From Swiss-Prot:
Shown residues in whole-protein numbering: 11 to 588 of 1690
Source organism phylogeny: Eukaryota, Metazoa, Chordata, Craniata, Vertebrata
Chain's role: Histone demethylase that specifically demethylates 'Lys-4' of histone H3, thereby playing a central role in histone code. Does not demethylate histone H3 'Lys-9', H3 'Lys-27', H3 'Lys-36', H3 'Lys-79' or H4 'Lys-20'. Demethylates trimethylated and dimethylated but not monomethylated H3 'Lys-4'. Regulates specific gene transcription through DNA-binding on 5'-CCGCCC-3' motif. May stimulate transcription mediated by nuclear receptors. Involved in transcriptional regulation of Hox proteins during cell differentiation. May participate in transcriptional repression of cytokines such as CXCL12.
Organism: Homo sapiens
Binding annotation for Fe cation: 207, 209, 295
Cellular compartment(s): Nucleus, Nucleolus; Nucleus
Signal sequence coordinates: none
Residue ranges of the motif GSGFP motif: 147-151
Gene coding for it: KDM5A
Protein name, as recorded: Lysine-specific demethylase 5A
Effect of residue 201 to V: In NEDEHC; uncertain significance; decreased protein expression levels
UniProt domain JmjN: residue ranges: 9-50
Superkingdom of origin organism: Eukaryota
Record-listed 2-oxoglutarate binding positions: 137, 215, 217, 225
Disease: A chromosomal aberration involving KDM5A has been found in M5 type acute myeloid leukemia. Translocation t(11;12)(p15;p13) with NUP98.
């Protein structure tokens, strides 16, 4: 049985007038987008920010992902835990590895592999015990390490005159409001975007953000990032289904720890009555996750994303 793609989440193509500030736009589209958990926003055609990361020094140690680790629990192999150690890549060397992996895996040029094929094969590999596929995920790279993907007027990197509008734009993830209101905030006497370098099959589990926060994600360049989302009204329904289908050894684990391994086929959630929506986030497009909207996904290939939590 092949994977059945969930219905598509809403995609918005705002005009220049509607693109004037994100918080007003997200607040207007919320009656529809909050019913799907996630939504995609395509900026106007002429809105093309530069890539402002320090590429000459960009290096990272991506985490190793055993895609079928949950299904493998039904088997202890000899010397388990020593499968593959983490290594350091550059932005170039990671891309060379990523493109070579995908082209070798599908026996096709990387740009010719349909998004539906990677999606179908990803969910087959997750539940396969006959094949052990291992990928790497350059996740949790702080924008403070090598700079944000967006230009920032902090004096650390040169900004051309035609790039200044992107350093001051409200859609620049460094210009999103992040300070939550509370009484403690008036008693005590800092959040920044995070970067994610992906390859084919690199994935993130079903989870919600801390404090049920909104999140916005921008794909600077590369192959698409495939998303799955669940609206907040079905959050407790997903949690009960996920706990019933997770291994019994993890069923009583707290949410913050359970979310570290929650890779689950969306078709199984949909069969249990959970509404799920999907999207392919392409280069230059935004994805907004709404409060308490569970979401997961994987990368179609070598790409570079930036994400931050924002408050309303
Ligand atoms: O890849 C992207 O574009 C962002 C995907 N979303 C992620 C991705 C992500 N990472 C993906 C790598 C990974 C893989 C497996 C388990 C945990 C993690 C955490 C880092 N972590 C988080 C996270 C962390 C803390 C609180 C809330 N969210 N969110
Ligand atoms: Mn997250």
């Amino acid at each position: 049985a092949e994977f059945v793609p969930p219905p598509e989440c809403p995609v918005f193509e705002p005009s220049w007038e509607e693109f004037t500030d994100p918080l007003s736009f997200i607040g207007r589209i919320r009656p529809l987008a909050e019913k799907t958990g996630i939504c995609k926003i395509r900026p106007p055609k002429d809105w093309q920010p530069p890539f402002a990361c320090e590429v000459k020094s960009f290096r990272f140690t991506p985490r190793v992902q055993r895609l079928n680790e949950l299904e493998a629990m039904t088997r202890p192999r000899e010397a388990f835990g020593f499968e593959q150690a983490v290594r350091e890549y550059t932005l170039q060397s990671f891309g060379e590895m990523a493109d070579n992996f995908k082209s070798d895996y599908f026996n096709m040029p990387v740009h010719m592999v349909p998004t539906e094929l990677v999606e179908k094969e990803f969910w087959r590999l997750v539940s396969s015990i006959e094949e052990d596929v291992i990928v790497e995920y350059g996740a949790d790279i702080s924008s403070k390490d090598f700079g944000s993907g967006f230009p920032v007027k902090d004096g650390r990197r040169k900004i051309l005159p035609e790039e200044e509008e992107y350093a001051l734009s409200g859609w620049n993830l460094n210009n999103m409001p992040v300070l939550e209101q509370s009484v403690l905030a008036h008693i005590n006497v800092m959040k920044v975007p995070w970067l994610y370098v992906g390859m084919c099959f690199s994935s993130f589990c079903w989870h919600i953000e801390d404090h049920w926060s909104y999140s916005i994600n921008y794909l600077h360049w590369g192959e698409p990032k495939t998303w799955y989302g669940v609206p907040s009204h079905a959050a407790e329904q997903l949690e009960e289904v996920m706990r019933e289908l997770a291994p019994e050894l993890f069923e009583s684990q707290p949410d913050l720890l359970h979310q570290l391994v929650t890779i689950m086929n969306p078709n199984v959630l949909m069969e249990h009555g959970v509404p799920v929506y999907r999207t392919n986030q392409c280069a230059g497009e935004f994805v907004v996750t709404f409060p308490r909207a569970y979401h997961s996904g994987f990368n179609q290939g070598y790409n570079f994303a930036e994400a931050v939590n924002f408050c309303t």
